[PDB]
Amino acid sequence: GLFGAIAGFIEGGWQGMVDGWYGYHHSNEQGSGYAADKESTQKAIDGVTNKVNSIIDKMNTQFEAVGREFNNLERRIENLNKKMEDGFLDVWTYNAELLVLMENERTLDFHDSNVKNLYDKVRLQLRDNAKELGNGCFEFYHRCDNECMESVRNGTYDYPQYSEEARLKREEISG
């Protein structure tokens, strides 16, 4: 994609995440598990639905063909009528197909932007209290249970609360 998140710096999708589009996998002493970011997926399901409806609403006024008949000496206006009717069908066929191709592209990049934007939402919370592995994961420089994890999933993660604890762990590695 255009942002490097989906099928980029974070490879592959999570079969086991069935609750949403974007989210978190955690691994501490209380085992593993998946959890969806409700805020970033509700914004995304509402964004895509509005677009889909916005595509349908733009085609409410569109050309409708009607049958007209002509005698054997009205071949010129019969031809004028056929070209005119095929002409608009081609125009609206082009307009729909192009609208589908164009928004499909921007929907996929919407999902790409949303995942990378979620990554940087967590990356700016941990700072140096965790290390960027470069595959979408952060290895903490301290202990993080299942309410600390919850604090970063809802963005309440208070930094200095683990600042000193982590610093000591960094000094052990740089020795």
Partner: protein, 323 residues
């Protein structure tokens, strides 16, 4: 020791649905929405509750003029649309043509109901023979003629000038039909109408018409080389129509009150009634769908999706899917 970690990722599943994009085709995605209806039931149905007028092997001219082979339609109820075949078998039984036929058919597409009324009783022609018939218009093994017009001929050996007027005293506008006969030679002319040189005048507040027979030799169509030429007018409520004639007059017998105007169409289909119901009908089958597009036929009537020439039209709603 590697410690506790939190990772960011996205949904994936077993979906196989593909989607097209400007730069890349067949991109597999987690969730997609189809917006193109591609299926129909292959039958002609009612539109909302209203049945179409299904002409069988009868054409609009056969119906309106009263081809004896179309008596099924002597008095049709309100219809939702008209169905006619491409090459109807029972059209003009006597050879000839229908003047401004296509403008008439177009008027018909704005009409949902006719009521036939009789405006000249066959027993009101006391100085003419009102019994013209032809082997080209058989009814029940015998020669007949159109039912809504009458073929007048000479009685004894005379054809007095017909001066007849009809006043549309109804509230509704009237579709009135009539004709003129073009014979093959002066002998046949004198046998049927006596007078060698004849005319027909038709007068209305707007119509000011004069017809004259074209007596001449022409190809046999269905064994006849004579021709019948038909005409029509809409007699407005309270206006009167005037006929003056000394031969070759195919006089109006029945006329049509325009009872209800509205949306209708004349569909060309070979299909037959289906005893079903729909809100969207095409000549090749009806549509019941909530998708905003379809590609089955450009000519539809009713509450319909928008026609497009596409074979496939799929929207991406979800995200790109991992192998």
């Amino acid at each position: 020791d590697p410690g506790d970690q939190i990772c960011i990722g996205y949904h994936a599943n077993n979906s196989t649905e593909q989607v097209d994009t400007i730069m890349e085709k067949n991109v597999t995605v987690t969730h997609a929405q189809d917006i193109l209806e591609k299926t129909h039931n292959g039958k002609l149905c009612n539109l909302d509750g209203v049945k179409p007028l299904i002409l069988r092997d009868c054409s609009v001219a056969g119906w309106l003029l009263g081809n004896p082979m179309c008596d099924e339609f002597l008095n049709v109820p309100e219809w939702s649309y008209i169905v006619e075949k491409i090459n109807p078998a029972n059209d003009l039984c006597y050879p000839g043509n229908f003047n401004d036929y296509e403008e008439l058919k177009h008027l018909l597409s704005r009409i949902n109901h006719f009521e036939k009324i009789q405006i000249t009783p066959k027993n009101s022609w006391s100085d003419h023979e009102a019994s013209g018939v032809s082997s080209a218009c058989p009814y029940q093994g015998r020669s007949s003629f159109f039912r809504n017009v009458v073929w007048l001929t000479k009685k004894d050996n005379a054809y007095p000038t017909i001066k007849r007027s009809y006043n549309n005293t109804n509230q509704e506008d009237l579709l009135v039909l009539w004709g003129i006969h073009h014979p093959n030679d002066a002998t046949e002319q004198t046998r049927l109408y006596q007078n060698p040189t004849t005319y027909i005048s038709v007068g209305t507040s707007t119509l000011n018409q004069k017809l004259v027979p074209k007596i001449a030799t022409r190809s046999k169509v269905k064994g006849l080389s004579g021709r019948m030429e038909f005409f029509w007018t809409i007699l407005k409520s309270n206006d009167a129509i005037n006929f003056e004639s000394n031969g070759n007059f195919i006089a109006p017998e029945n006329a049509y009150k325009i009872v209800k105007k509205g949306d209708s169409t004349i569909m060309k289909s070979e299909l037959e009634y289906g005893d079903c119901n729909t809100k969207c009908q095409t000549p090749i089958g009806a549509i019941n769908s909530s998708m905003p597009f379809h590609n089955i036929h450009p000519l539809t009537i009713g509450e319909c999706p928008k026609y497009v020439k596409s074979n496939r039209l799929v929207l991406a709603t979800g995200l790109r899917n991992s192998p």
